[PDB]
Amino acid sequence: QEVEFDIPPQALGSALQEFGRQADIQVLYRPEEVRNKRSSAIKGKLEPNQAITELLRGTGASVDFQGNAITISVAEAADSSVDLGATMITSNQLGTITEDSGSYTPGTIATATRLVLTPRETPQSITVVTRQNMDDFGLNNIDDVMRHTPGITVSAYDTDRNNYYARGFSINNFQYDGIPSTARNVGYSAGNTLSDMAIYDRVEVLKGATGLLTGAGSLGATINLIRKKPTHEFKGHVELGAGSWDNYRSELDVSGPLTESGNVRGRAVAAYQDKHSFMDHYERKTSVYYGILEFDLNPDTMLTVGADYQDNDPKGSGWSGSFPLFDSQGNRNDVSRSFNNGAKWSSWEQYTRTVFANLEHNFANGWVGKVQLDHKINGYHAPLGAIMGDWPAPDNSAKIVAQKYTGETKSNSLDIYLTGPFQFLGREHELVVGTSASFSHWEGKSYWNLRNYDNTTDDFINWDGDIGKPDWGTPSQYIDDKTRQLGSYMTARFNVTDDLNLFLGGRVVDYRVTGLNPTIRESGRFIPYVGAVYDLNDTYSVYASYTDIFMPQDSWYRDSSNKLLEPDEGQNYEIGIKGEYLDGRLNTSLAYFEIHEENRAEEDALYNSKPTNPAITYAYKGIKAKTKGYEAEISGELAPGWQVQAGYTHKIIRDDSGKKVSTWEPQDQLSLYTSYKFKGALDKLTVGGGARWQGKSWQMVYNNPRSRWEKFSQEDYWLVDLMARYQITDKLSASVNVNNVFDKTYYTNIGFYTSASYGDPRNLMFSTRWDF
Numbered sequence: 001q002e003v004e005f006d007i008p009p010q011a012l013g014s015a016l017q018e019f020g021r022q023a024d025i026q027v028l029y030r031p032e033e034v035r036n037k038r039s040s041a042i043k044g045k046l047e048p049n050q051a052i053t054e055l056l057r058g059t060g061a062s063v064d065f066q067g068n069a070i071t072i073s074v075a076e077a078a079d080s081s082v083d084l085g086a087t088m089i090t091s092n093q094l095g096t097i098t099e100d101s102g103s104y105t106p107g108t109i110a111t112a113t114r115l116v117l118t119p120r121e122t123p124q125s126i127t128v129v130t131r132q133n134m135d136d137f138g139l140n141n142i143d144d145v146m147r148h149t150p151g152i153t154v155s156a157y158d159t160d161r162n163n164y165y166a167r168g169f170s171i172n173n174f175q176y177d178g179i180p181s182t183a184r185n186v187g188y189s190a191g192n193t194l195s196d197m198a199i200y201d202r203v204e205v206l207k208g209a210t211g212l213l214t215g216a217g218s219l220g221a222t223i224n225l226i227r228k229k230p231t232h233e234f235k236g237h238v239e240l241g242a243g244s245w246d247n248y249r250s251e252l253d254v255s256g257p258l259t260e261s262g263n264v265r266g267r268a269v270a271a272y273q274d275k276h277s278f279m280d281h282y283e284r285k286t287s288v289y290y291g292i293l294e295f296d297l298n299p300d301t302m303l304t305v306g307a308d309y310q311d312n313d314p315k316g317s318g319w320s321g322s323f324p325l326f327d328s329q330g331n332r333n334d335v336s337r338s339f340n341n342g343a344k345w346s347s348w349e350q351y352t353r354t355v356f357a358n359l360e361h362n363f364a365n366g367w368v369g370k371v372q373l374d375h376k377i378n379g380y381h382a383p384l385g386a387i388m389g390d391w392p393a394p395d396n397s398a399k400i401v402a403q404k405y406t407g408e409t410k411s412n413s414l415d416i417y418l419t420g421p422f423q424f425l426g427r428e429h430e431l432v433v434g435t436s437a438s439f440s441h442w443e444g445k446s447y448w449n450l451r452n453y454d455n456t457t458d459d460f461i462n463w464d465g466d467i468g469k470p471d472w473g474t475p476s477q478y479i480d481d482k483t484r485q486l487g488s489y490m491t492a493r494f495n496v497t498d499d500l501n502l503f504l505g506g507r508v509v510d511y512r513v514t515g516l517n518p519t520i521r522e523s524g525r526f527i528p529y530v531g532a533v534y535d536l537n538d539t540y541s542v543y544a545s546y547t548d549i550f551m552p553q554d555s556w557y558r559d560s561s562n563k564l565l566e567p568d569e570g571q572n573y574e575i576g577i578k579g580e581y582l583d584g585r586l587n588t589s590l591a592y593f594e595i596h597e598e599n600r601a602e603e604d605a606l607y608n609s610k611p612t613n614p615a616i617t618y619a620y621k622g623i624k625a626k627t628k629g630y631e632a633e634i635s636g637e638l639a640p641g642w643q644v645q646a647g648y649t650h651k652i653i654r655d656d657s658g659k660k661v662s663t664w665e666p667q668d669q670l671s672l673y674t675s676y677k678f679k680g681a682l683d684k685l686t687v688g689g690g691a692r693w694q695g696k697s698w699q700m701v702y703n704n705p706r707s708r709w710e711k712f713s714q715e716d717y718w719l720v721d722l723m724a725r726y727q728i729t730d731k732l733s734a735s736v737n738v739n740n741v742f743d744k745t746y747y748t749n750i751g752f753y754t755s756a757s758y759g760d761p762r763n764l765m766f767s768t769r770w771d772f
């Protein structure tokens with residue numbers, strides 16, 4: 001609806017940028033088409049379709065309305081063939097906002113090269129979970145989004161950390177509004193597995209090898225979380241939710257201009273959740289606050305500052321899985337799904353807070369530049385106590401391990417980039433040149449020297465977490481890790497012919513880790529980027545890419561001779577076809593991909609079987625591995641009210657000897673979610689469901705009381721979801737979510753420290769949302 005506008009007659013470029021701004025809309029236009037053109041003047045309360053048409057009066061330009069984006073074009077009488085991937089300047093650097101798009105498919109995205117492109121133009125597997133997806137299925141946190149993400153397998157470490165795989169690999173790359181965090185290990189990484197969705201517009205996942213913007217990082221995927229932004233019109237909501245096992249969620253989200261002119265603007269959100277669980281004596285309080293302010297210094301420079309906060313506060317935390325696989329004499333334990341090996345008082349609370357500033361400037365060039373400053377904190381307070389070992393013993397006793405770790409990581413980021421169009425051989429291309437620096441400092445205390453503790457409980461079968469807390473004694477250890485990343489990067493997208501676009505670039509990287517371990521240094525590392533996209537129809541394009549990444553190894557991954565291994569490196573090879581239907585409203589993709597890892601840390605059994613250097617008691621050995629596989633996906637509008645997101649992925653990852661690895665990631669998986677909105681007398685009703693299936697998965701785990709290895713399998717299984725919403729009122733709606741409808745009982749962890757974990761049993765959630 002109607003928006004306050006005031007854009008005077010200027011260069012068509014500026015006008016278009018000032019429009020997207022004033023209108024909360026992404027505006028895409030071709031540099032060589034708006035050169036030397038004038039916007040006509042607009043002033044007052046206007047409907048955005050009426051406002052853009054006025055603005056373009058005189059320009060000979062056409063508008064394509066596409067949801068939260070408009071593309072502008074300048075039809076010629078000549079027009080002699082069609083450039084679908086023509087170089088196009090964008091007004092929102094991060095992409096198309098997904099909020100209010102009614103869609104499960106995204107618009108534009110800069111996840112791959114910091115160039116704003118569409119899924120179809122991106123020569124890499126890119127899946128997005130959109131704001132409407134999160135809304136409809138109740139995905140209230142990053143674990144929820146991941147479970148619903150095509151390609152992704154979420155498995156458990158314990159009640160407060162999950163693991164995400166793509167393509168053979170745990171994901172350990174996270175970004176916020178396009179800024180990587182340090183996630184070397186779980187000290188730096190507190191809370192990453194727990195981000196509440198209340199403050200995000202979408203989560204965008206780039207799959208393969210993502211060196212080019214992540215820098216040093218894991219193989220497999222990057223998870224990029226995009227924050228909600230302030231708006232030009234006043235709008236907010238309150239949401240209230242109630243579910244299986246005294247799960248109560250509430251949520252406030254307010255957005256608007258804070259001055260008559262609306263040249264300062266703001267958005268605020270808060271959300272609180274207190275929940276018990278199907279797991280006995282586990283409970284979790286979670287708190288999030290987010291505030292962001294936008295100042296327009298003038299028509300082409302905007303200062304933004306903002307801050308976020310999240311506290312994740314549990315009781316009944318476990319260290320590793322929900323119960324021990326084998327008992328004292330080495331039979332397998334049968335236990336209720338409610339069983340929780342955590343102690344009542346045990347807690348792995350994880351907290352995160354960010355303060356950030358950015359500055360963005362439109363050069364007349366058609367170029368835009370942007371500096372991003374960040375102060376981030378990932379903190380933790382972890383007195384963990386939990387039943388551990390081959391228990392029960394024949395008399396039903398068992399033994400608790402208890403250890404305390406507290407600590408904090410402070411991170412500072414500088415990121416600066418320049419992006420813009422340019423002409424080479426009578427045709428238009430774009431460039432990004434950026435440089436980055438991060439310093440992060442992990443500090444901590446460990447307590448493992450317990451003073452006068454009795455770690456035995458006399459009743460395994462009826463365990464309850466009702467065991468005393470120990471005297472933790474004095475600290476055992478103080479941590480001091482310093483990581484310093486420096487990056488410089490460049491990607492050109494050449495529009496070679498009307499059907500061929502060529503990506504050429506890379507990143508140079510300097511990585512230093514300092515402190516209590518010996519110094520880890522990589523200098524002048526080059527991370528190539530080669531990509532092409534070739535158009536075949538108005539509908540389909542093929543693409544190929546070659547992408548890369550490395551991660552200097554952790555300090556403990558040393559060899560025979562006590563030298564650290566060379567960095568864990570991989571290259572992703574990918575060939576593919578993507579399809580685009582209904583003016584971008586529906587996307588499809590089919591891809592073939594191959595990952596070549598070199599220097600993967602491997603144990604080194606012959607040495608470890610009787611070490612010879614007391615300096616490395618547990619040596620590694622750097623080896624090779626290959627992931628081969630393919631993936632299919634679709635997302636968007638099937639028919640007017642009808643939305644899907646579905647994927648199919650196949651993988652086998654082997655190491656050079658031939659043996660299967662990440663065998664707990666299934667070799668085959670499939671996701672489909674969908675909702676439908678009736679038209680007619682039922683137009684206030686939205687219906688929906690979904691299903692996730694995966695094949696066989698296994699672990700090899702060591703039965704230590706019987707001195708043999710065992711194979712633990714999880715037979716293929718489906719999970720089904722259902723969902724419905726009714727818009728009772730222009731302002732008020734009611735929803736219900738049923739998850740795991742057939743109550744399928746399954747495992748999300750087998751073998752992590754010789755333990756296992758169930759997945760959620762059937763669970764409901766009721767909600768009301770109220771929009772002011």
Ligand SMILES: CCCCCCCCOCCOCCOCCOCCOCCO
Pocket residue numbers: 234254255256257258265266267268290291292293305306307355
């Ligand atoms: C260096 C640290 C800086 C921290 C910055 C934190 C920013 C927190 O501020 C929150 C601002 O939110 C603005 C919320 O928008 C509300 C707009 O509605 C106002 C009422 O409506 C007026 C008439 O329409």
Ligand SMILES: CCCCCCCCOCCOCCOCCOCCOCCO
Pocket residue numbers: 734735736738762763764766767768
């Ligand atoms: C072991 C768990 C088995 C439970 C299975 C139950 C499945 C039944 O689900 C159907 C629920 O329908 C109940 C209808 O309730 C209406 C929801 O309205 C929302 C409240 O409105 C808020 C008003 O402001």
